[PDB]
From a paper:
SKD3, also known as CLPB, is a ring-forming, ATP-fueled protein disaggregase essential for preserving mitochondrial integrity and structure. Ankyrin repeats are one of the most abundant motifs found in eukaryotic proteins and the Ank domain is the defining feature that distinguishes mammalian SKD3 from microbial Hsp100 unfoldases. Here, we present the atomic structures of the isolated Ank domains of SKD3 isoform-1 (ANKiso1) and SKD3 isoform-2 (ANKiso2). The two isoforms differ by a 30 amino acid stretch present in isoform-1 (exon-5), which represses the protein disaggregating activity of SKD3.
Owing to a lack in our molecular understanding of the Ank domain, we solved the crystal structure of ANKiso1 at 1.81-Å resolution using the single wavelength anomalous diffraction (SAD) technique. Although the crystal structure contains only one ANKiso1 molecule in the crystallographic asymmetric unit, it appears to form a dimer in solution. Amongst the Ank motifs, Ank2 is most unusual and features a long β-hairpin-helix motif instead of the canonical loop. The electron density for helix α5 (residues 232-240) is clearly visible in our experimentally phased map, which is sandwiched between the β-hairpin and the concave surface of the Ank domain. The interaction is mediated by hydrophobic contacts between the side chains of Phe236, Arg237 and Trp239 of α5 and His300 as well as Tyr305 from η1. In the crystal, this sandwich conformation is stabilized by the C-terminal segment of a symmetry-related neighboring Ank domain, which wraps around the β-hairpin, and may provide a structural basis for dimer formation in solution. Although the overall structure of ANKiso1 resembles the AlphaFold2 model (AF-Q9H078-F1), we note that the long β-hairpin with the intervening α5 helix is unexpected and markedly differs in both the location and secondary structure from the predicted AlphaFold2 model. The structure of ANKiso1 suggested that binding of helix α5 may compete with substrate interaction. The crystal structures of the Ank domain showed that all three MGCA7-associated missense mutations map to the Ank2 motif and cluster around Cys267 that follows the long β-hairpin. Interestingly, the Cα distance between Cys267 and Tyr272 is 7.0-Å, which is within the range of Cα distances between disulfide bonded cysteines observed in protein structures.
Author numbering: 129 to 207, 228 to 244, 257 to 345
The structure:
Amino acid sequence: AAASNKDAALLEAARANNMQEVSRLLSEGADVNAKHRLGWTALMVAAINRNNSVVQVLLAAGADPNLGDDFSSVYKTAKNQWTSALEFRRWLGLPARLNNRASFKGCTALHYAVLADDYRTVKELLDGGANPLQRNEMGHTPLDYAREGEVMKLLRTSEAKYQEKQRKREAEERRRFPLEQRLKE
């Protein structure tokens, strides 16, 4: 049970913003990707907490930035279809009746950091390999949740660089590409 207990204690420490306990538990082999019964990982709850310090520690310990929230309850937001990103923000109480269903399933730490408009945590997650194009169950990217401002500007830049990196990784080997070939499929 020791291993299961370290996982559960790691999640409690992250939810409580206890950076010292998070670090201890990670060094003792707690599963950095463990999920709470409420659905979230330590990385996600650190993002909800706007704790960019704990986020950095988790990433340095190998946390997978692109795991999705397991919480699968669905809510009706009014008196179907997934609510829009703008109405999802409103439903969360943040600044700014057909599609009235809401779900957290699949939200990444980056979704939460952007919802919180937390530039420092957003930058940490992107620098640690978070995929800004990955969608949650409702089909929303983190950029869909951004307020205008520095987080939005950062995400636009990061989307372009992530797509560039992906295109370079998938690149096909070709020894020659004469200009005439641009005219042919």
